[PDB]
Amino acid sequence: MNTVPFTSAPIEVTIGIDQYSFNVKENQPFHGIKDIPIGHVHVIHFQHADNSSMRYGYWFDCRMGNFYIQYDPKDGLYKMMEERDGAKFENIVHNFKERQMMVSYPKIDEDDTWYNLTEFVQMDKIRKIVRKDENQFSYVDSSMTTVQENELSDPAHSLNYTVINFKSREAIRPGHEMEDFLDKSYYLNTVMLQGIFKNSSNYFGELQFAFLNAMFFGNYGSSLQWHAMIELICSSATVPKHMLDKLDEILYYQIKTLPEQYSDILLNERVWNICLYSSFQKNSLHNTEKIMENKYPELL
């Protein structure tokens, strides 16, 4: 089990760890989070009690180093940092554990939610979308814009998601305009899967990461990216059967986890009706269609 210890908690803050969260009061004796499952990526995120503006957080993988949080009173935020002195870090984690000033990652044993949301998400791919190569972890917040958004202003702080555009030369073969626009299989399978992502796992991983940035940080461009990657599959007549089955599972757990109250902003009516009712895949997303109809029948 891994641990993310905290130097202190000087300001009141709601702290999230993956899909869990807890309130920490100003100067409460809080010193971090223990029992974090090894083998998955994780996200630790923050919303100050004085500013529900700017949710922000850090994607990390405990196998890549020893990480800890300390509040920076100049920049005014909880910062992730790395301690390469392993002895010193193990020592600091042991005393905090002995004084019981840490919350436990509260995973129910029956619960596969986090695995199902992050199945294909890799830290190495996250670090290519969020470019800050001197750190092993990746900062994201509510306000960061995507490359594609910037094209339509600071590139160092951008989300470098794979650009998908249905009305672009990349998507449309000369001479197959109508064919390729109505059936996007060539753009999905040749351009994107074979050409750019290399395999469907990398595609799904980016799709899952965009959704999670949309859910945890309300990141608008991430929501756009998640819907675009969905729409490209739903608008393709020819999709490997294993990809359709896995997409249905992916989307099921994403819809299941979404807050019932955020459906109005994080769900694009047009794309979902296409996937579920008009598209080629109308009959192929059985789990996703059932949970959507029973939980958000308004949207449809």
């Binding site: 009305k167 672009s168 030369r169 449309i172 305009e177 109508m178 626009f181």
Partner: protein
């Protein structure tokens, strides 16, 4: 953005633009079969592509052979329209290519945008105007060339005849849309109005009769009367 009553004078500035109307591209007659079912039979169609400033009309004739063995013809018709407009633009010298293309029906926006990806600097625009270009097939010489065609063909016309020698393009477009609106509302009346006087003929190289200025004023009044009446005859007023 969309073209409407407020940005109407833009049509007559010196930025080359074309209206594209696809209404008459896919045309059918509906008939009964021997078994008593219903079938369609396609007839020749046309794309109506018009420079409103100059009157140049690029009438691309759509031969029924282009539908053979195709499904979902109404959807295909929009893509075929787009393919042919794009081909037209590519055939033109750079300095004659339009800066804007205005489509008369919103369903042409995506087909045309996709076919024109090679011309990112050509704006594809809808309009809020209810233009009467579908009535182009009520102009006898245009209907005649469409129906006689035995293969795909482009025919070039000036839809304003020689009017621009005496009036502005704003006035010429207004006359054209009045004539066409009249032909759409009551074709027979409209045509009677235009041809009633046998001494006023249509030159071989023209589409409309050789009215004097005074005669165009009388004609235009008769067309307005026609349109208002049918409006009453229809809504009872």
């Amino acid at each position: 953005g969309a073209m409407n009553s407020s940005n109407y004078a833009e049509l007559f500035n010196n930025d080359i633009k074309l209206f594209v109307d696809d209404t008459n591209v896919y045309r059918v007659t509906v008939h009964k079969t021997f078994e008593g079912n219903v079938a369609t039979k396609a007839i020749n169609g046309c794309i109506f592509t018009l420079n409103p400033k100059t009157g140049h009309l690029f009438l691309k004739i759509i031969h029924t052979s282009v539908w053979a063995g195709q499904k979902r013809l109404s959807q295909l018709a929009k893509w075929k329209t787009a393919e042919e407009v794009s081909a037209l633009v590519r055939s033109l010298p750079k300095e004659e290519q339009p800066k804007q293309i205005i489509v008369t029906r919103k369903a042409m926006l995506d087909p045309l945008e996709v076919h024109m990806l090679d011309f990112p600097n050509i704006a594809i625009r809808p309009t809020e105007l209810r233009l009467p270009f579908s009535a182009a097939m009520s102009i006898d010489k245009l209907s005649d060339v469409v129906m006689k065609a035995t293969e795909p063909q482009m025919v070039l016309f000036n839809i304003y005849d020689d009017w621009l020698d005496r009036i502005s393009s704003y006035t010429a477009f207004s006359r054209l849309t009045l004539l066409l609106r009249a032909l759409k509302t009551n074709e027979e009346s409209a045509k009677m109005i235009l041809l009633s006087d046998p001494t006023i003929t249509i030159k071989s190289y023209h589409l409309w009769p050789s009215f004097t200025d005074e005669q165009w004023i009388t004609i235009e009044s008769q067309m307005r009367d026609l349109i208002l009446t049918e409006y009453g005859r229809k809504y009872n007023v």
